[PDB]
Amino acid sequence: RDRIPLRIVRAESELSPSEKAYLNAVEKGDYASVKKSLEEAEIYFKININCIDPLGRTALLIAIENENLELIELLLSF
Amino acid sequence: LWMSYFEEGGTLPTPFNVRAADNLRRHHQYQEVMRNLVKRYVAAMIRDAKTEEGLTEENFKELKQDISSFRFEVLGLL
Amino acid sequence: RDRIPLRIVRAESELSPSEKAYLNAVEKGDYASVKKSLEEAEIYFKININCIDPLGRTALLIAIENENLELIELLLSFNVYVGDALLHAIRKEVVGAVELLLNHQFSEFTPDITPIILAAHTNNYEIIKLLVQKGVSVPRPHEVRCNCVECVSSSDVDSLRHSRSRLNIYKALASPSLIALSSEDPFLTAFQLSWELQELSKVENEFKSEYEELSRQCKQFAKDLLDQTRSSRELEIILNYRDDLARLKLAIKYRQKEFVAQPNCQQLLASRWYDEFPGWRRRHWAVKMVTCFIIGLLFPVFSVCYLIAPKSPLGLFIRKPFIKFICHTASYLTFLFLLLLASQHIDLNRQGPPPTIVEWMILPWVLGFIWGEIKQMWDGGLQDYIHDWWNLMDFVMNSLYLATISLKIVAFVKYPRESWDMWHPTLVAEALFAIANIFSSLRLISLFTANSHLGPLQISLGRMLLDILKFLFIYCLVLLAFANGLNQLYFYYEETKGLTCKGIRCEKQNNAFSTLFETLQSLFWSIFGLINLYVTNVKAQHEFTEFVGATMFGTYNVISLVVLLNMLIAMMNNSYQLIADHADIEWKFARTKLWMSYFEEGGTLPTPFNVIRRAADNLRRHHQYQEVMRNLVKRYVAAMIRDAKTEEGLTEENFKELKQDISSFRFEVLGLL
Amino acid sequence: SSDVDSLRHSRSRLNIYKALASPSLIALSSEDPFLTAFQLSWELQELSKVENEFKSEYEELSRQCKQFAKDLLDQTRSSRELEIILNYRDDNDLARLKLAIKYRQKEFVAQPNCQQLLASRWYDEFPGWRRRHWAVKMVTCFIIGLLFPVFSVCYLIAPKSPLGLFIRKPFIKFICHTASYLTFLFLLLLASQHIDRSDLNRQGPPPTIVEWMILPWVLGFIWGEIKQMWDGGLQDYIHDWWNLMDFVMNSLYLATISLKIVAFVKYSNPRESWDMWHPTLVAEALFAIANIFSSLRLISLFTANSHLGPLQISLGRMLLDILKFLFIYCLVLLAFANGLNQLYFYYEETKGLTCKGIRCEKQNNAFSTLFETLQSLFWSIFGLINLYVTNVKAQHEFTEFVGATMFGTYNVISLVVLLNMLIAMMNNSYQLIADHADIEWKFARTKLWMSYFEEGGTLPTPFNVRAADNLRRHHQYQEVMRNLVKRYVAAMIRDAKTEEGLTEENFKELKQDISSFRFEVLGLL
Amino acid sequence: SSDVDSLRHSRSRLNIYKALASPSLIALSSEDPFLTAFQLSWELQELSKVENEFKSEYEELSRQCKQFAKDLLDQTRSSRELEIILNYRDDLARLKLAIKYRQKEFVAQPNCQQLLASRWYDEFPGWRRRHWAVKMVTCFIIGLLFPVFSVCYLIAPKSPLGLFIRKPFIKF
Amino acid sequence: TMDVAPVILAAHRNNYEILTMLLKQDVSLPKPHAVGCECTLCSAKNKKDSLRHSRFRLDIYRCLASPALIMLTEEDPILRAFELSADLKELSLVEVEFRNDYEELARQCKMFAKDLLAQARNSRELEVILNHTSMNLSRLKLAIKYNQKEFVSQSNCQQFLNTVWFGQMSGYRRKPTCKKIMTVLTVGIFWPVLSLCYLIAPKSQFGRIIHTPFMKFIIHGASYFTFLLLLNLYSLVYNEDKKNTMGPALERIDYLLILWIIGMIWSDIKRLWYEGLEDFLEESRNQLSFVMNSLYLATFALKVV
Amino acid sequence: IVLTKLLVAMLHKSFQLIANHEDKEWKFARAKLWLSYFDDKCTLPPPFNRNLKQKRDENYQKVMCCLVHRYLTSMRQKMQSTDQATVENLNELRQDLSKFRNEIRDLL
Ligand SMILES: Cn1c(=O)n(CCCO)c(=O)c2c1nc(Oc1cccc(OC(F)(F)F)c1)n2Cc1ccc(Cl)cc1
Ligand SMILES: Cn1c(=O)n(CCCO)c(=O)c2c1nc(Oc1cccc(OC(F)(F)F)c1)n2Cc1ccc(Cl)cc1
Ligand SMILES: [Ca+2]
Ligand SMILES: [Ca+2]
């Protein structure tokens, strides 16, 4: 072939779209949407609290790199 | 060279050479003056580290994310 | 006309107030004003949604460079035309690539840049991961020595476009993130890509710095990928991955000096080197040289013990690589001691009986040298033998030894020293033996690589020897010019009447310029001041010819001593300033090569004495290597992401993004209030 | 204006030239920004040379214009754009490339795309000559060098022949010219050695061995240098030192020929009875000096090689600094030579000696006259003057001591101070020119390539003796160059958004903006 | 543990020595941070000698410790504080310790050199302020009259001529 | 530090606004002592606290060396910058312990003076600030006297020196290099004619030729070259039987030579008298001239004896 | 072998050091020679060899006041265009943002 095929040999972990929205809202430093996401995560939902990105960026770790004291307090609270 | 020639021994050139309380006081004096020294030192490195420093990508990320979180909090309030 | 009028020759389409106001509204970041502008553009058609700024900024492009997504979604709602805006979002490192991919002239980018090539050029992990997940394929570059019909047809149609496409493809493949995503073996891919890029840099004299930078980037990526190891088991898995230290031999073959001189690989090599030893680095220096001597003398005992029974404890003491290196060094020093005994202790014999007092012991060492060089030249590759200059020195000294023993045997089996012929075989044998003794005792510079102090100096010498050859070419041309000219003027004043020593090598130097060979020798010897000034004298009473000869000789001295020989010092100083920064890495690479030359069992006895289920195992090795490599790639990706945002420098577009964000927040507050 | 306000006039001229040399104005208002950049760089170079004040600003402006031209070439992305840029003329020509070479735009020519086009033109009709093993390159260069006369006579007989068109390839033309010069040097080297006649003849008749074969080649050189003097002007001839040395060598060959035919026609006996100014001896010496000038031309042939072309170029750069320091050396040499002559010349002696001067078996009368003193102090740098030249045959010990002291002082200067100063100065000069060596070598190699690109001079040294088209070219150049200007301003604005720089003005800008927003909120809410 | 995982053990020792050589931990936890800096610099130098690999890291750590000691000398602001620090002993005993441990950054301090020049020119003011010919004349007349000051302090140590040898400049 | 006043720290941060509000409050700093002051106080403060005294002196001389305090409170900032740079260089020579700091403050003063002269716009302003004394160039004579390298290397000052130096023919720079060469040569030939015509009739155009200082340098160099040529002519005409006879005899060349020698000694006396003796001893060229003149005078005295 | 090559190394570093401040030193020495030859004291070659003060001070004061104004403006322009933002300026910006947020919370 004259074209190199590209694929992820080490595919690692994958995330749900709700988990991706949770992580993106944590990155945006949102109060209401992140709090609501953890509230629906209390009941049986797709959203897992200990969601880890394949970049090794958990919402805990993201909020640590986000430095938002209110957000990190919210995450340690639940 | 100077401190080799500071000694009381060897004062003659080669032609013609052919208590607990005091220790406690010295220890306390050295300790007090070096509390002063380390206080000045930590003030100096705190002052130095606060200037001549590049902000780079992380400081911009924090500063932009604070505005994003502020905007989302205002939108939640209003 | 006392004044230069100015006009816009490069006339654009400009901007009407309404379109300029709309573009400025997208620039500021107002949600409501831009929404109202596109609502007016939809049903009244006063302005165009796909408008062009005078310097080339459609509204999607300002919304890209301001790094906000709300106006991206809004502009894609009314289907604003998108061209290379995906490429602009990729090069700006925006997370809006998903928004631009999920939807449905003057281009700054060349038409030969597809999105995955630009994503690899920017070296952004998330963009390349998203593009590989979406489905994309980099076009395969051809061979670096390819002469196919498609290649020459593309060069005939547009050679610049083809060269730029090859450079863009090889910049895309050389990115660390694409290697971390796609390649099955990142280390082997990095080695092969560095070799390929260096071969392209040799082939392409043009764009040479780009390919050299790409090869440096690949070698550095391999170095950091090895740097992220955190255990000895992982290192032993990586370096012994065949398809032993097989990967280390492969890295030596591909000349990855940054990978080899990596500290943990050096720890593993030191552990294999000083095996079962109390610690040579944790030892006193005098004790170290004392025990060096004490294994120096015990060389024949360990050698014959390995010869009779390798399973003996003394037959296993030699099997350690440091002990066999000491034994080889002791054997070479014994051979040089035999040479010194031959020189000091040894007449009128025409046929020249061979000195059996010494030469009967030297000849087994010569046979061992020939056997070792033949085995190294055949078994172990061909071009890597001729690449090493010390192997060339071994070949020269072995050819000289063979010629010497052949000439001595010939003169012994078929044949007053002062009555000999000038080309007598004994004299030529003696001259060749002397030159070969020079080479044999100059071979000891190769043993300075194992030392921790003289090694960098020897490596620094060996890097500017080639540059010395480059300067010696220019000096040789200057020497030939002046020698040929001096031979012209003096050829006819050849005084050979009763002098008994014609040349420059007598007490009275005569006929120094009487022929081209003697002129070349006499002009060579004038560098060191051994040529007197009266060699420019003729037997006659001519004066102008003497003055022209003297001024040509002086002009040569000036050129070859003040100009050229002092040019050489400055050029050496620049070369050593360029070399000494990387001297430690090259010394560690050469020392590693010297160390693992003794690691294998392909030759264990010293020089003078040596003339007497599988699929399941491969699956296990591949699984272990892939798990270790997954961990290594994860660690390297996390480390590179962390360091990348640690030092950026805050280019001004971040501040422009900050101003646009604050302006958007102010406009949203105005809209809400 | 200079008499009224000289500083105001000079600052006004500097500001006007700084405004005209801006990349943006040039890219917006100048009709021909390549020619405008070239002419402005040349004019700013002349202003830097004339006005020694404000020189740094003028050379920075010239460097900025050269930077602008290089970036404008770097914005090309096709071969046809490069071909329509380089071949454009005001009224395969490469006229713009000739004009850029004339205006000394180094980084313009050393651009990778221009190098690629010139290498495509240099190896005309060659199926990957560079994609070869070096041994194969060596043997194929040897075999084109060997068959030089057959290609020459093929061009003289049939220009339309494939062998007659083989010489029209610039690489083969260069190889054949080098083969002709190497055969000329081999002929001179045989002339040094093949000669085995009496060498006593009074007039020195021209032999058929080497003479009458050196003669044509010499007059072919003369005709070629006359042609290069006519074509390109006298200034381009004297710009290159290599052409100056070629002219000197041709003048020496003409002088040798004239002296030999004078000896043929007049004064036509042992060799030792000849006068020191005999015409045959002068012809001999002038032929020798012309030979040492002719055999140094192979250094000019070394700019084409990649491994050592930058080295030869760097030596050519710092030769000027060598002469710069040799002026100071000449002052020191004159000072000490005339001092030592003023000391020792009262002690001139002859005594009927066999030889006088420094160039004898025993040195004597070294510091006798000014010429001999200059010669003796020159040779003392290389240690060929012994220490017994400083003492007088008489017993005047004080004059001997002060002469030896002056000689030792000059030796200390010119062997410790000045030579080591020269070494350190050379060190700094080569450190400075090591970065610019590559573009200088590429510029010199393109000059050497484009010397052979022209139609004239195709034969080697043995055989040296409309408005609608203009409008179409103008419109093609205008549209391509408009695309180039648009690409360049887009890339320059993008780099302006790329440079890692944030002053304290922008932090104050953000602070003022957020404070204004806060005060607006507090006014409203 | 080295036989099990040599890499992990070497990384562990490097991490521990990088933690101990931090200036903040030295200033916060050590009894005598000058003595700790001296001993840690010597230990890091000998560790770089023993460990030929990882030598650059240990040299960087030792230079960082020496820079910390030099900065802690920079923070002083009185000659009394210098006399407390340099004469501390558990006589310029701490300056002897800095000499022994090869702390060239600590020793070449401008304040330490001020104290050393004050002690070297014992009761000898204006020596640098006076003219070069004048001070060389004074040096020549002291060195020419050497036997009279050296015969003193051998017979009469408490004499002013006997006490002239007490000044280290006169002794040199 | 406890010895730092607010105005000293304000000069340290070099802000003009803080200065222009602080000096409105009638604030004066302590006056530092001289280079070698050893009075009853200065010999006692070194005994008291040497480090405190040295830091106080460094703080005061960093406060004075700020450009803001020079430009606010002095009559002449250029003169204050010159004197402060000279004083700081002398202190760095004296204070061995703080050479880098005092040298840096001297460099900052020199750079401030250079930039303050670089803000000159009109040539009239440049002539005013260069002819000020407390074509004449008294301020530039001070600047060379105070060893200000950056002040005189400025483009405006060098341009003014070019216009003064070239004299009437300001288009000499406009001439090509070949024309400059032959102009220099044709002035170098007939230099005694120009000197004599100045000595007779300075009113005419050739009389005013020598008052051009570039031309004055050209006749001076040609006069020294003529002296050098006469020196070679001595050996070319060394045939007065002096090679043999013992008693010296003076020729016409030696008469001219001793006339040149008394002329050079008269120029040396004029340099020693009008400008002084120390500045004569500073220049190595003047030392070479002195040793040359002593050697020639001893030679001719021994010749007469 | 040792001392002369050490001298060569020392001169190499020295000529690297002077060469940056080379043109300025040459111009200073040339100006020294020029001002030595600017006088009317001895124009011949070796062989031939008050209210006005107040007005001048007032003119100098006007010119120097203008120069001080221009240099102050140029110095503040260069200072504002050359210095780089540090982390403490970021800290003031975080302070202004937090003060906005706290005033918004207190008002609402
Ligand atoms: C090439 N050459 C030469 O051959 N001879 C020998 C002639 C017969 O002995 C010379 O005497 C000779 C010479 N170049 C000479 O001046 C140099 C100028 C510049 C550099 C230089 O080089 C270096 F700096 F010294 F390294 C040398 N001089 C000295 C000289 C002699 C007579 C006269 Cl009128 C003028 C100058
Ligand atoms: C100039 N000069 C000289 O001319 N002669 C020759 C005199 C007749 O032989 C000398 O012998 C001679 C000499 N300078 C000398 O000391 C040097 C001083 C400075 C530099 C130098 O050299 C260098 F730069 F370092 F390389 C050498 N010496 C040696 C000497 C001889 C006697 C006495 Cl008492 C003291 C010293
Ligand atoms: Ca070998
Ligand atoms: Ca030519």
Ligand SMILES: [Zn+2]
């Ligand atoms: Zn192909």
Ligand SMILES: [Zn+2]
């Ligand atoms: Zn005082």
